[PDB]
Amino acid sequence: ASGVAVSDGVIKVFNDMKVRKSSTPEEVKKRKKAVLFCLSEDKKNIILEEGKEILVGDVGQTVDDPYATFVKMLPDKDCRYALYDATYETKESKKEDLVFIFWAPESAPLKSKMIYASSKDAIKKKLTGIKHELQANCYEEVKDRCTLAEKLGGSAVISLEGKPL
Amino acid sequence: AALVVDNGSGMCKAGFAGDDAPRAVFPSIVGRPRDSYVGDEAQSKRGILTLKYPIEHGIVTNWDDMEKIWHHTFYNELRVAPEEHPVLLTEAPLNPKANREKMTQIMFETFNTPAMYVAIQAVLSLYASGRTTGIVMDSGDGVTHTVPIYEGYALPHAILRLDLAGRDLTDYLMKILTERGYSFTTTAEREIVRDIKEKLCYVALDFEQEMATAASSSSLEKSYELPDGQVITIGNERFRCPEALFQPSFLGMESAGIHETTFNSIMKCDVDIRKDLYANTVLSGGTTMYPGIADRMQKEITALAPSTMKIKIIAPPERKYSVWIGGSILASLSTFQQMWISKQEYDESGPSIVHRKCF
Amino acid sequence: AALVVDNGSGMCKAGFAGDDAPRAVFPSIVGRPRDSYVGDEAQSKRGILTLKYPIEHGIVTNWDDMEKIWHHTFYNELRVAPEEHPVLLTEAPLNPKANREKMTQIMFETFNTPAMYVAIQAVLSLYASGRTTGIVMDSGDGVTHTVPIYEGYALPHAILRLDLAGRDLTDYLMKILTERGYSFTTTAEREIVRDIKEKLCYVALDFEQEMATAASSSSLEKSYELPDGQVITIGNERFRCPEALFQPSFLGMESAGIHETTFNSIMKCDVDIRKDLYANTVLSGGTTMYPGIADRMQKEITALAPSTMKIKIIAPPERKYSVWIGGSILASLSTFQQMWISKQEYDESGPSIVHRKCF
Amino acid sequence: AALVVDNGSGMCKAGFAGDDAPRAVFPSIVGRPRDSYVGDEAQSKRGILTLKYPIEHGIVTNWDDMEKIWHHTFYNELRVAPEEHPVLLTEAPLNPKANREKMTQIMFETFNTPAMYVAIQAVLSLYASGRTTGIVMDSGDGVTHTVPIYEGYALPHAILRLDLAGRDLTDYLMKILTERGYSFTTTAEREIVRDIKEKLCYVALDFEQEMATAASSSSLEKSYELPDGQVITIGNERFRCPEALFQPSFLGMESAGIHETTFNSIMKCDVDIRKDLYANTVLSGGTTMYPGIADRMQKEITALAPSTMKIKIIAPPERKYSVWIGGSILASLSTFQQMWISKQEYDESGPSIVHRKCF
Ligand SMILES: Nc1ncnc2c1ncn2[C@@H]1O[C@H](COP(=O)(O)OP(=O)(O)O)[C@@H](O)[C@H]1O
Ligand SMILES: Nc1ncnc2c1ncn2[C@@H]1O[C@H](COP(=O)(O)OP(=O)(O)O)[C@@H](O)[C@H]1O
Ligand SMILES: Nc1ncnc2c1ncn2[C@@H]1O[C@H](COP(=O)(O)OP(=O)(O)O)[C@@H](O)[C@H]1O
Ligand SMILES: [Mg+2]
Ligand SMILES: [Mg+2]
Ligand SMILES: [Mg+2]
DSSP: OOOOEEOHHHHHHHHHHHSBOOOOHHHHTTSEEEEEEEEOTTSSEEEEEEEEEEETTTBTTTBSOHHHHHHHHSOSSSOEEEEEEEEEEESSOEEEEEEEEEEOOTTSOHHHHHHHHHHHHHHHHHSTTOOEEEEEOSTHHHHOHHHHHHHHHGGGEEEETTEEO | OOEEEEEOSSEEEEEETTOSSOSEEEEOOEEEEOOOEETHHHHHSTTSEEEEOTTTTSSOOOHHHHHHHHHIIIIIISOBOGGGSOEEEEEOTTOOHHHHHHHHHHHHHTSOOSEEEEEEHHHHHHHHTTOSSEEEEEEOSSOEEEEEEETTEEOGGGOEEEOOSHHHHHHHHHHHHGGGTOOOOSHHHHHHHHHHHHHHOOOOSSHHHHHHHHHHOSTTOEEEEOTTSOEEEEOTHHHHHHHTTTOGGGGTOOSOOHHHHHHHHHHTSOTTTHHHHHTOEEEESGGGOSTTHHHHHHHHHHHHSOTTSOOOEEOOTTOTTHHHHHHHHHHTOGGGGGSSEEHHHHHHHGGGGHHHHOO | OOEEEEEOSSEEEEEETTOSSOSEEEEOOEEEEOOOEETHHHHHTTTSEEEEOTTTTSSOOOHHHHHHHHHIIIIIISOOOGGGSOEEEEEOTTOOHHHHHHHHHHHHHTSOOSEEEEEEHHHHHHHHTTOSSEEEEEEOSSOEEEEEEETTEEOGGGOEEEOOSHHHHHHHHHHHHGGGTOOOOSHHHHHHHHHHHHHHOOOOSSHHHHHHHHHHOSTTOEEEOOSSSOOEEEOTHHHHHHHHHHOGGGGTOOSOOHHHHHHHHHHTSOTTTHHHHHTOEEEESGGGOSTTHHHHHHHHHHHHSOTTSOOOEEOOTTGGGHHHHHHHHHHTOSGGGGSSEEHHHHHHHGGGGHHHHOO | OOEEEEEOSSEEEEEETTOSSOSEEEEOOEEEEOOOEETHHHHHSTTSEEEEOTTTTSSOOOHHHHHHHHHHIIIIISOSOGGGSOEEEEEOTTOOHHHHHHHHHIIIIISOOSEEEEEEHHHHHHHHTTOSSEEEEEEOSSOEEEEEEETTEEOGGGOEEESOSHHHHHHHHHHHHGGGTOOOOSHHHHHHHHHHHHHHOOOOSSHHHHHHHHTTOSTTOEEEEOTTSOEEEEOTHHHHHHHTTTOGGGGTOOSOOHHHHHHHHHHTSOTTTHHHHHTOEEEESGGGOSTTHHHHHHHHHHHHSOTTSOOOEEOOTTGGGHHHHHHHHHHTOGGGGGSSEEHHHHHHHGGGGHHHHOO
């Protein structure tokens, strides 16, 4: 509990990501498939990392699979908060749930790891409705599609982003 | 894009009209500390909170908790605004008329749904099988119903209710697994036993013959891996747990089995239509997904029915979600758009309009 | 400029918030003649006085002597005024609630600290590694703790305490160094053996294979020269001394090793969360600084855990002072200034305020 | 002279029919090196051995180790030949029929007893209190059972099992005595803590009120002398250790207390007999010997039961060995000699004779 609060920009972005409003397909393409959150310069608020986001419209035209490109956006030596809209298919349902991803690599500086870990339980309480959490502490624990599928529904998941495992 | 919600006694099925399978299937529980968790959130905390079933036996008993489940359904599970999509609700058989108006009032005043509709779960199961006349043995989580239907209308005087379903079988499997040395008592361990029941349990055609087979060899034993990596072995408990459906005395229950309940509800109908109900027995619900349950039901009802009657048990492969899939197809039809209860129509006639528009 | 004090079982770490390493690291001892000496002063007199540990096993037992250590810490070691700086204290797992209020009462009444805060040592170690869920096996001077943590909250029913740590290993090394003819019995000689242990001891992956290697050649011998001119040559004692951690029977102790203690504490948690604890085992404390201890724990726990579980032992390079460094980072944050227990709040709520603000 | 053997979960009671008290009372453990020690022999070696409970939870799980216990019972404890005396065995409630045939087979072939009999522990306790209808709260070493009995027949569908008994209370006392600075971790120190529990612990009528009383004075403190001559003082731990029976959350358990388990098992019976079970609640087992447990159970159940029902908790002074003394009186009757299962009858009907002669 480091007291780091969540900026209103992150809350607004999460609200659009969670609840889908009926909109024209042009606005549907502007929906965020994935987004990264980072500490501010003064380390007082959780803010949106500018330029680090994946749009639904980018999927299928410039982005072939949404997960591997999202992993590439993760810094190698820095901690980051992530929100991934996972579209997967189970043996008896096609599900679309948000995944809160805690990226804290071992190569990250000690100061970054301590602040992000201690403030994770505060930001996740503000983002109500998220039922999946992925804590990755190395590149191996986040780059694999089967790792995300195991967290989503375990062995019951048969597809992820429209591609079989 | 309409919404289809199947408010089951133990599991809530939700999705969009036109889809083949429900998007969200979560337990219908509300958890409060021993401040309020709904669905899988209430099961993630395990033992700190106490869980309550608002629709425990298909009939809603706590309307304050059901308003939380519907709110959790639209925003957290379906991730849509209920004010922008018409919602199709399903109701259990023998639902009191007071409850039907309550769902209409909640949908239009709290969630502000543009349109709304109520359908009977048993009728949707029968229609999904291509039938309008027959008897539906809808065995769910907390309640088992045998609903004889003639020309699309259920016969209320012949509908029988059995408080014996998958919830009681999961508790019985937990009890008989302790005879092998295992210990499943906690809420988390109850979900593991439920997964064992859904994967390894089956109905034996001849229970006494099957018991002798399991006591003379190990060909019926199966291995299951726990979430912590431990592997357990289950033997004769595979067919003993679902045997309580046909022998409720295994649970200390004084009622009859699902085969006699189906036969008794047939005998409560008109004698001229009993021949049609014998050959049109349709299984529905999750508790009817045990392999060999259709062959066992066929054998048991045959021993009860007259020898000249043709007994035919219908077990469609998609009978687990036949209520929801039937509703989704119906709600996606362009010709069904005139059957909705509009908000304008609700403002004039009030909640009582559901009786004349949805019967 | 806040103060961070880590009250360890045998070593007291203190410093200022924002610094990378503690400024003062001195033994937490009180010496009285066989009139009161604390820290290195009590060890400088050697054998004339008798030394007592007030916090011997992580839990403060003699509150009168623990006050002197705090007085020595603030005035003699940190050379700072207690009333001008908020102080962040650390507590061992399973610390009784009665002790927590006593630390708050002493800080506000004796030292008149403007602000106060208590943190769990195991949680700070886990947070410093970038984890909110995991098990921290904290091996210090007088006690070893395996503390499973889930979302930042330690599970008290699964916390296991082992009375086997570096203090016992130092005594064990002295006992086995006498088999080679060297003599170490005095208090001054004990500190020499401790320096030997911290520099030449290592954990062997295979103990029996390593023993054969040391008995067939001299490649494992590392000649250590004492402050005087004897120049001992420690051979197989390099890996025999830390082997007592995994084989406590070497010390005549019936308790299990650190690998079995970690596994037993995992098995006391929920079966759902055991998978996450296996892959998030974090080492902390000075006694975990032997080279090869992470690999040995990985091999030992794997033989205990199911083969389908992924065992991952995390040994950060800074794990010796991970408790203090984690506290220093937290106490130096501008947003953390709202979580201090102010003196105005202690005056209203009394010593019981710490239970709500520090959990 | 018949033999009466009470196979408890943690302690084995043996003796002769007609005696007032069992001759031999030894722990039911089997010790093997970390080659076979049973009873007090396995506890005399302390930590050099690993101890296993073959009947850990009232139900036999390791039949190979049980034969060692029975062999130790007859020859080393009773000092008699099994082939010269009939033996009366006691079984836990909900004992599978497969186990009952196994005990019959073992005593007739391995020990060659002339006669043999099986009795239910709960029914023997109820009979010893002069009742045929009632509910028995049998709390022993490793398991606690609530067995409702109507006209001498236990109701299997309403029997509830709680894995919380004296063994878990001894460990909890060990855990909370370390908060006072004491160290009880070894097997030898566990027997000392067990003696402290059996002599100084009591059940507080009002737990919260008693904690305030113990926090304001020293009238509730008691002194105990260790076998080595030392003296320790225990305070509020006297009533906190048995409080885990009514608040299992003290041990991290999600299960309900003994008062709620008794109430839940009553509510699982027929509505007409619940009135008789409320006024005929009989306590049995060693763990029910805490002073004040009958008054606490009376108050706790009363708050659960309707105010119009009469709650009467029966706590006979001999309830620690009510199962054995009930068996010894029954086995010593001349009219009971026709109820034995003879070897001649076993040679004809096989192990299945026990189902028709002992029910
Ligand atoms: N494959 C399966 N085999 C046996 N039982 C199942 C299977 N799948 C689900 N069930 C059982 O069905 C029950 C709920 O099914 P469902 O009919 O959807 O519930 P509801 O009562 O809400 O309609 C669960 O308790 C579960 O134990
Ligand atoms: N490099 C090292 N190798 C082995 N042991 C060490 C090393 N450094 C410190 N220790 C041991 O760690 C013990 C105390 O370390 P620490 O974790 O600070 O104790 P505490 O947590 O009780 O304050 C000392 O007794 C010392 O023997
Ligand atoms: N006077 C007493 N007060 C409290 N506990 C007791 C007393 N006597 C025995 N016990 C406890 O009862 C437990 C088991 O007794 P018993 O009923 O013989 O168990 P079992 O039925 O499993 O043989 C022991 O662990 C012991 O701690
Ligand atoms: Mg249903
Ligand atoms: Mg420490
Ligand atoms: Mg007993």
